[PDB]
Amino acid sequence: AENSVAYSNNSIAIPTNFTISVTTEILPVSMTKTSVDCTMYICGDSTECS
């Protein structure tokens, strides 16, 4: 939305009331831990491929 602050060199704007806002912030920390095997993934139950 277009706004225009009414600026002049003798006028100020002071709040007379307030509000208390509780906002939410979501942050990732860790991810899934995985582990791999060579022979079970690549060949798998194969002696000559191992």
Next chain:
Amino acid sequence: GVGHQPYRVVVLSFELLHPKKSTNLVKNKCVNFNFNGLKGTGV
């Protein structure tokens, strides 16, 4: 005699253009299996 006796002879011609007998099924032991051309290794 033997050389003059009639003999029943079967002549079997083979056309070389194209099987194995199935073995016992083994469970709970890791074997290399053939199943109708599907080859693998497992329990």
